Design a protein around this ligand. Structure first.
Ligand SMILES: CCCCCCCCCCCCCCCCC[C@@H](O)O[C@H](CO[C@H](O)CCCCCCCCCCCCCCC)COP(=O)(O)OCC[N+](C)(C)C
Ligand SMILES: CCCCCCCCCCCCCC(=O)SCCNC(=O)CCNC(=O)[C@@H](O)C(C)(C)COP(=O)(O)O
Ligand code: SF4
Ligand code: SF4
Ligand code: SF4
Ligand code: SF4
Ligand code: SF4
Ligand code: FES
Lengths: 108, 112, 208, 262, 112, 176, 109, 94, 44, 360
């Protein structure tokens, strides 16, 4: 599908957030999100970080991944089957395809 | 002699027997200060002298470690080495009292 | 009474019993009692001051060549004159068998660290320190792990809410993630499953 | 002057007379029960309380025989246990598979007694009897069928509410604790039976279906509808009151409560 | 009864003063290295305040235990452990104001 | 029992010596592994052509939830509410009130995939076999608020798939 | 008076403006059982709990509503909260009075 | 899937993959299966069961205790020493 | 939907052998009857 | 470019488990364990179900034990695949990865098939095992298992001789055989330094009495020996699968004791006691006698250890979870002083650690 995992945000755009988040970890996450080039995206994944999921009630989790970054598509699962993920990202492409900054920019 | 050694940290030591005699003698001597009071001197000497009796009894090594009932006597010499510093601790800990202190009985009552 | 119930060997119960007696006599300056859990698990007690000397011998041969801590657990209980209740598993190899010494401790009394005696206990001192109040003396470096930085209050204190007292969230006006009191949604629904009628006549304490 | 008696092992200087049940209650060990209830009256039905005498071959109802003369009693004796399983299978031989819908489902005593003692395999293999409902008033939701004839409720009515409108009827199976004749039973202590009823055979209509026992928090306090000041356990399913129950207190309500307050 | 550190008060108070010296002097380095834009004074004042927070503790061992828990934080800021977020955390700056006046609270919410 | 990996040691025989030396200078095992990946170039690729093809699953597989009806057209759920009582994530929340007919029913059965862990305890728990962990596994969505299913949503899922689910349960229940 | 308030990270608000409420729990009256009745526990006072604007969930603010702790003796409990420096409302154990019973008294006349 | 390639492939491999071709499953187990019927279980006899016997959790007993210090002679091992293991028999070295 | 005939007590399960609601016994003939969850009333 | 001291800081994924476990009944606590050493999801469950059965004094019907060992072993293969592979990927081998995760996916087809989930299969139960496995399975496992060995072998041809790979990992990072024991290293990290110990042979817990297999001792204690131990243990597990396939008795799989094991659905829907025990097993859950224990089993990374204390209530009071990785990672900095910075990366991998297990 052309997607290829390449480390170092500066050479990457969309971000997967697989797996449970924790308190100490969060600031690093916000750092990495900030250092990405526009047009950056992210993808919450699993019941993991959609909102704590299984670990919704503990002192160290940070509920949703939503509460530190502006998520795009969600891919519910625990773990989501990798294929359901695949449907996830294809859905992400079917959301980029509806992007239209140029049509709007001319309009404004 | 014995090629290898088995355990990576273990270092092959030819002619254990001498070193063994220094072992058990240092044993009995360093524990020789134990007042007859504590039963430690009793048991530990009990086995010690038995094993050492096998030491004199068994100049050969190949069946010797079939005699000490411990794989690679080469390690257990260091076991005894542990017992040496053990005895070095035994009297720093002094001869044994019939219990220091007792915990309040309100505790130690499981369940809750 | 065969297919379901476990057979429970008498033999092991014997050997552990006698061995418990064996250590009980060898060093009784401190062994409060050498109870054998009936499913073959020996476990002697220790006066809290007595930790190092016992464990020390516990590595030292007689039979107690119980090398390697399996763990350094810290059971809590709100009652008792001293709440926290530390526990040490141990394993001997050549005689392949496990024992479990344990003590007790005040919220405030500093029991000594046992890192030197069992060798691989450096991480645990830090653990129990940051999961509890209890302090270990002669420990090279207690410090937080399994937490955030500040965070403060020890968890696992048997009290202390699981939801804690705080939360992080990113805040654009200051452009930074920040702490803030829990504001928790949905609330931890708390069932009270526990039920009347004691199931266990074989235990059950005297009414007193 | 008070007799010595042995609960299974230890001696106990028990009060003169007083039922074996009360003896073990005094040592705190708890016999399985249904029909008996203090603050009500003793009865020989529902022989789930059977216990074995230290020597006498056959078991006797725990709440029946008063203790005397240095008796010993093995509550945990195996023959006692076989007795209890014996009875429990009979009780469960007809009580309808209603646990998920029966509103008593969270804490019905019959469930817990079934867990602690009753044999787990079924070995009844026929057809349960089942019976039509008997409408009774604005409050109580009688269902019967789940009825087990611990007469209890009648012993409630004749001996406390004082009304004797309801009562047992018929013999053998088909005997019913429902009152004959359609007539409604209204009384000021009609509400407390919803508490007293052993199972789900009688449960409050207004509260019905609304909630489940493991859910609700159970605050303690006192009634205000009366200045009588009876103690209570209010029960709330998170941010909202569900149902009221009496909380026992010797000076006032003692396990009972009014009805307007309920 | 085993003391943690210092016997009796005052012996422990000196510890805490030492700690204040360490924190105070370190603070400008904290503002510099972390690029914190807090007024350089403010951190100092806030330090003094945090030092006022337990300025009534009076138990023997508890205070030294307090400087144990006090070491680790400067221990972290000096090692650049924690971060801008983590160290800015103390100022509670995002919080909505909460007056302690009875009536003020009274209008706002159901309160305790 | 115990086995020595390694421990075996090379021969000093000159034919063998020249062999190892020639091995070092001329990279035999290197070209061996290189020949190995050459060999895997010629095997048929394992990829499935998703979406157009989709991976194998099982009758027991767990996915999207969906309350479902009697054939009569009546709903199955009866608010024994223990689905709430057994879910470890406690995702479920239920608030029953009586039917006008007097039958037990939910008012706002709801669930949130945000917390659900798809363990399938609910699938086991239901006495009337109402809630069922449906075969569907794809319902990734744009907005968090959509995850938090309402009762009506579950019913609609139960409507969409009913022949399918009934097929799985038909194929599976005997093993239960 | 072994106060440990500084050691616990608990915010001052909840060692102050709320109270524990020690008691031995009452029997659920629907039950005839007695087991759960015994042994002291240390429930805290309730605070506010509103409703989620969405979905109607009982969203809640207070840090520690659900907390509860068993005990073997009341004195231990009071002393416990004292170690914490806690405000408290100790309540009496209220064991039922023993009662006379007689199957034959039903047949006086 | 052709002789022109498979021969070269196997020779490049030095393993001859065609005997296995494990990197795909050409024809494994059929999916639809006959109904299970499935085993009954040991205690299902109605004629003789008593939970008072079959129970296990009721056999739980308070720990055996020794000393309770709170309230010749000979030396002895916790257990007899285990023997040294035999060396693998069929494949002594790897 | 229409009520099944009876005289008198009879089974219900919701029609799903180990798939319906757990078996119960409705107990009416000429009277309207039941029920569990299955509406399978026995008015006849 | 040399390290002077690596300073690990775990807790970056401390989800906070043990506090949560205490509030949830036994049956509801089980999934946490999959969520632990998630690469080795079955063996954790088996560790727990043992840990309860001892307290509960109850023994699984034998067939269940054969499954429990069987999937214990397929999981043995999962963790070893993941370990050897990603340890290779860390040092850039890239390829073997893709050659193996095909297989690993075929194994998840099995978790898929019996449990209904591709992984995190909450399938092992304290009472024994959940649903019985489908008829069509065992031949399918057979057909795979016979052909797997060529795959592992070809892997070995890309690695074990590949002298580049040898040079990178052969003199690092040796640990003294006794010094291991002082740090309480477990599983392969012990055997690499040549000590004989192994829990399946030593203190067998299941039908390991009835299976025969060769434990592979290492020698030098370098990462390389540990690697060969990984491979050889894979082959040995592959031996176990044969025996378990050849002696897999008919019988029930859940324990008969309905007080602990929920009734089968066909039964609970048609008899009272069945439905009641069903109901209470899911509402309140089963009680356990009050008590305490430490079970441990040969999890692929090392012994996995459960210390738990029933209060007698249906909610376990405390459930400290030994994590074998935790000790290893503790021992790392001693093992890795003065080594080149790449080598510390490889040596993290020989530790085969998984942080989800460390942070518990
Ligand atoms: C009249 C007589 C004139 C001369 C006749 C004799 C000829 C002289 C001998 C010819 C030798 C030339 C070969 C080139 C030098 C080889 C040494 C090289 O291999 O160094 C080793 C290092 O090896 C290299 O680094 C290999 C890595 C190269 C990776 C690319 C793989 C190449 C694939 C094959 C491509 C061939 C294409 C061209 C073929 C025609 C270091 O050895 P050592 O430290 O002791 O241990 C490692 C041993 N190895 C070889 C097994 C790894
Ligand atoms: C920049 C902002 C980030 C850092 C903010 C400040 C960090 C400080 C962390 C807090 C650490 C502590 O406060 S530890 C305990 C301090 N000790 C006390 O408060 C003791 C109070 N008791 C007293 O008697 C005090 O009045 C005094 C000041 C110690 C009295 O002094 P004596 O005359 O010696
Ligand atoms: S999704 Fe399943 S696996 Fe991923 S974190 Fe949440 S629970 Fe653990
Ligand atoms: S209440 Fe009646 S029906 Fe509901 S569970 Fe208890 S016994 Fe079965
Ligand atoms: S009325 Fe209440 S008490 Fe009388 S029988 Fe029916 S259920 Fe038992
Ligand atoms: S089990 Fe299924 S049907 Fe019965 S209550 Fe819970 S959800 Fe409603
Ligand atoms: S899905 Fe698994 S976890 Fe979520 S509710 Fe149904 S059972 Fe509980
Ligand atoms: S109370 Fe003893 S017979 Fe029912």
């Amino acid at each position: 599908f052309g997607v290829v995992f390449r480390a170092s945000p500066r050479q990457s755009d969309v971000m997967i957030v697989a797996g449970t988040l924790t308190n100490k970890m969060a600031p690093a996450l916000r750092k990495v999100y900030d250092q990405m080039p526009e047009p950056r995206y992210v993808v919450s994944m699993g019941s993991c970080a959609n909102g704590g999921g299984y670990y919704h009630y503990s002192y160290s989790v940070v509920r949703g991944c939503d509460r530190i970054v502006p998520v795009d598509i969600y891919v519910p699962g625990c773990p989501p089957t990798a294929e359901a993920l695949l449907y996830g990202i294809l859905q992400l492409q079917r959301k980029i395809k509806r992007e239209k900054r140029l049509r709007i920019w001319y309009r404004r | 002699l014995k090629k290898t050694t088995g355990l990576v940290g273990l270092a092959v030591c030819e002619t254990p027997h001498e070193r063994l005699k220094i072992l058990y003698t240092k044993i009995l001597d360093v524990l020789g200060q134990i007042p007859k009071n504590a039963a430690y001197r009793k048991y530990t000497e009990q086995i010690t002298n038995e094993k050492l009796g096998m030491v004199k009894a068994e100049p050969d090594v190949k069946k010797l470690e079939e005699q000490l009932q411990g794989g690679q006597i080469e390690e257990v010499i260091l076991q005894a080495e542990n017992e040496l510093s053990l005895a070095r601790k035994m009297l720093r800990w002094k001869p044994w009292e019939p219990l220091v202190e007792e915990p309040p009985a309100n505790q130690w009552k499981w369940p809750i | 009474t065969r297919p379901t119930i476990r057979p429970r060997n008498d033999v092991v119960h014997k050997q552990l019993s006698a061995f418990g007696q064996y250590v009980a006599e060898i060093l009784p300056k401190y062994v409060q009692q050498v109870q054998v859990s009936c499913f073959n698990e020996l476990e002697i007690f220790i006066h809290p001051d007595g930790v190092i000397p016992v464990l020390t011998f516990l590595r030292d041969h007689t039979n107690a060549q119980f090398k390697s801590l399996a763990d350094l657990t810290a059971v809590d209980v709100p009652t008792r004159q001293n709440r926290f209740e530390i526990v040490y598993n141990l394993l001997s190899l050549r005689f392949n068998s496990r024992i479990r010494v344990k003590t007790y401790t005040d919220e405030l009394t500093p029991i000594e660290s046992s890192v030197t005696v069992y060798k691989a206990a450096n991480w645990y001192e830090r653990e129990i320190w940051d999961m509890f109040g209890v302090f270990f003396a002669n420990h090279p470096d207690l410090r937080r792990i399994l937490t955030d930085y500040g965070f403060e209050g020890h968890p696992f204190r048997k009290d202390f809410p699981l939801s804690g007292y705080v939360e992080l969230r990113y805040d654009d006006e200051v452009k930074r993630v920040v702490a803030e009191p829990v504001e928790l949604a949905q609330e931890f629904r708390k069932f009270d499953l526990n039920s009347p009628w004691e199931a266990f006549p074989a235990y059950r304490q005297p009414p007193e | 002057n008070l007799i010595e008696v042995f609960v299974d092992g230890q001696s106990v200087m028990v009060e003169p007379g007083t039922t074996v049940l009360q003896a073990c209650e005094k040592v705190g060990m708890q016999i399985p029960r249904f029909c008996y209830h203090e603050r009500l009256s003793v009865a020989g039905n529902c022989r789930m309380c059977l216990v074995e005498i230290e020597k006498a071959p056959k078991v006797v109802a725990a709440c029946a025989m008063p203790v005397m003369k240095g008796w010993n009693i093995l509550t945990n004796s195996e023959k006692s246990k076989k007795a209890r399983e014996g009875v429990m299978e009979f009780l469960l031989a007809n009580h309808p598979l209603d646990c998920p819908i029966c509103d008593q489902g969270g804490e019905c005593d019959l469930q817990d007694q079934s867990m602690m003692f009753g044999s787990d395999r079924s070995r009844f293999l026929e057809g349960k009897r089942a019976v039509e409902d008997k409408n009774i008033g604005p409050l109580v939701k009688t269902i019967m069928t789940r009825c087990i004839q611990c007469t209890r409720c009648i012993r409630f009515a004749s001996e406390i509410a004082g009304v004797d409108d309801l009562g047992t009827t018929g013999r053998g199976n088909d005997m019913q604790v429902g009152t004959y004749i359609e007539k409604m039973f209204m009384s000021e202590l009609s509400g407390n039976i919803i508490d007293i009823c052993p199972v789900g055979a009688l449960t409050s209509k207004p509260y019905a279906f609304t909630a489940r026992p493991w859910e609700t928090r159970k605050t303690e306090s006192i009634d205000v509808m009366d200045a009588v000041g009876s103690n209570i356990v209010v029960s709330t399913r998170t941010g909202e009151v569900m149902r009221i129950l009496p909380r026992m207190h010797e000076d006032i309500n003692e396990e009972w409560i009014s009805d307007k307050t309920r | 009864v085993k003391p943690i550190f210092s016997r009796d008060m005052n012996e422990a108070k000196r510890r805490v003063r030492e700690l204040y010296r360490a924190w105070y002097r370190e603070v400008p380095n904290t503002v510099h290295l972390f690029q914190l834009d807090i007024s350089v004074k403010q951190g100092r004042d806030k330090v003094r305040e945090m030092f006022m927070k337990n300025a009534h503790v009076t138990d023997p061992r508890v205070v030294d235990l307090l400087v144990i828990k006090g070491k680790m934080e400067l221990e972290e800021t000096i090692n650049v452990w924690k971060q801008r977020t983590h160290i800015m955390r103390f100022f509670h700056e995002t919080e909505a104001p909460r007056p302690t006046d009875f009536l003020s609270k009274f209008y706002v919410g159901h309160d305790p | 029992t115990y086995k020595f990996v390694n421990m075996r040691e090379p021969s000093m025989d000159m034919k063998s010596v020249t062999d190892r030396a020639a091995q070092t200078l001329l990279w035999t095992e290197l070209v061996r592994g290189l020949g190995m990946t050459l060999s895997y170039l010629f095997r048929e690729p394992a990829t499935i052509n998703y979406p157009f093809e989709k991976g194998p699953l099982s009758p027991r597989f767990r996915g999207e939830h969906a309350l479902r009806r009697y054939p009569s057209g009546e709903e199955r759920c009866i608010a024994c509410k223990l689905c709430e009582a057994v879910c470890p994530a406690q995702a479920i929340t239920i608030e029953a009130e009586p039917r006008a007919d007097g039958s037990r029913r939910t008012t706002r059965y709801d669930i949130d995939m945000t917390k659900c862990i798809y363990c399938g305890f609910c699938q086991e728990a239901c006495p009337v076999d109402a809630i069922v962990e449906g075969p569907n596994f794809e319902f990734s969505t744009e907005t968090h608020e959509e995850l938090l299913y309402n009762k009506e949503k579950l019913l609609n899922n139960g409507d969409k798939w009913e022949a399918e689910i009934a097929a799985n349960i038909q194929a599976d229940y005997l093993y239960r | 008076k072994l106060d440990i308030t500084t050691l616990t990270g608990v915010p001052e608000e909840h060692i102050k403006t709320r109270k524990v409420r020690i008691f031995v729990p009452a029997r659920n009256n629907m039950q005839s059982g007695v087991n759960n009745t015994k042994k002291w526990k240390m429930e805290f006072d309730t605070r506010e709990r509103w409703e989620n604007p969405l979905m109607g969930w009982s969203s809640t603010a207070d840090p520690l509503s659900n907390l509860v702790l068993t005990f073997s003796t009341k004195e231990d409990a009071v002393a416990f909260a004292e170690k914490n420096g806690w405000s408290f409302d100790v309540e009496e154990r209220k064991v039922p009075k023993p009662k006379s019973k007689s199957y034959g008294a039903n047949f006086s006349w | 899937a052709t002789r022109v390639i498979q021969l070269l492939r196997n020779w490049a491999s030095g393993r001859d993959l065609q005997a296995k071709l494990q990197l795909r499953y050409q024809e494994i187990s059929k999916r639809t299966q006959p109904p299970p019927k499935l085993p009954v279980g040991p205690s299902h006899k109605l004629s003789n069961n008593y939970y008072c016997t079959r129970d296990g959790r009721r056999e739980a007993m308070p720990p055996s205790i020794v000393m309770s210090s709170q309230k010749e002679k000979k030396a002895v091992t916790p257990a007899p020493p285990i023997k040294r293991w035999e060396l693998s028999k069929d494949q002594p070295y790897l | 939907p229409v009520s099944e005939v009876g005289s008198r007590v009879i089974s219900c399960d919701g029609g799903g052998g180990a798939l319906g609601h757990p078996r119960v016994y409705i107990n009416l003939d000429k009277e309207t009857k039941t029920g569990t969850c299955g509406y399978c009333g026995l008015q006849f | 470019e040399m390290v002077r001291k690596c300073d690990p800081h775990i807790g970056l994924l401390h989800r906070g488990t043990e506090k949560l476990i205490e509030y949830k009944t036994y049956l509801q606590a089980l999934p946490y364990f999959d969520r632990l050493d998630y690469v080795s999801m079955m063996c954790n469950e088996q560790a727990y179900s043992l840990a309860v059965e001892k307290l509960l004094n109850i023994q699984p019907p034998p067939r269940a034990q054969w499954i429990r060992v069987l999937f214990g072993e397929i999981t043995r293969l999962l963790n070893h695949i993941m370990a050897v592979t990603t340890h290779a990927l860390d040092i850039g081998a890239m390829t073997p990865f893709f050659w193996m995760f095909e297989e690993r996916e075929k194994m998840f087809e099995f978790y898929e098939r019996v449990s209904g989930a591709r992984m995190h299969a909450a399938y092992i139960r304290p009472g024994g095992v959940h649903q019985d496995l489908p008829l069509g399975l065992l031949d399918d496992i057979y057909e795979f298992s016979k052909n797997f060995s060529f795959r592992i072998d070809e892997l070995e041809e890309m690695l074990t001789n590949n002298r580049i790979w040898r040079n990178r990992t052969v003199d690092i990072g040796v640990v003294t055989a006794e010094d291991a024991l002082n740090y309480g290293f477990s599983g392969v990290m012990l055997r690499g330094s040549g000590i004989q110990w192994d829990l399946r042979k030593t203190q067998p817990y299941d039908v390991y009495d009835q299976v025969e297999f060769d434990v592979p001792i290492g020698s030098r204690g370098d990462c390389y020996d540990r690697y060969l131990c990984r491979v050889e243990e894979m082959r040995q597990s592959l031996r176990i699968i044969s025996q378990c396939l050849n002696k897999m008795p008919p019988g029930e799989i859940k324990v008969d004791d309905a007080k602990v094991s929920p009734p089968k659905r066909a039964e609970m829907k048609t008899s009272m006691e069945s439905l009641i025990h069903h109901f209470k097993l899911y509402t309140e859950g089963y009680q356990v006698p009050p008590g305490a224990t430490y079970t441990a089993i040969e999890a692929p990374k090392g012994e996995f250890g459960v210390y738990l204390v029933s209060d007698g209530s249906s909610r376990p009071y405390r459930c400290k979870i030994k994590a074998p990785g935790f000790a290893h990672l503790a021992g790392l900095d001693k093992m890795s002083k003065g080594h080149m910075l790449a080598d510390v990366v490889a040596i993290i991998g020989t530790q085969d650690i998984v942080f989800g297990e460390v942070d518990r």
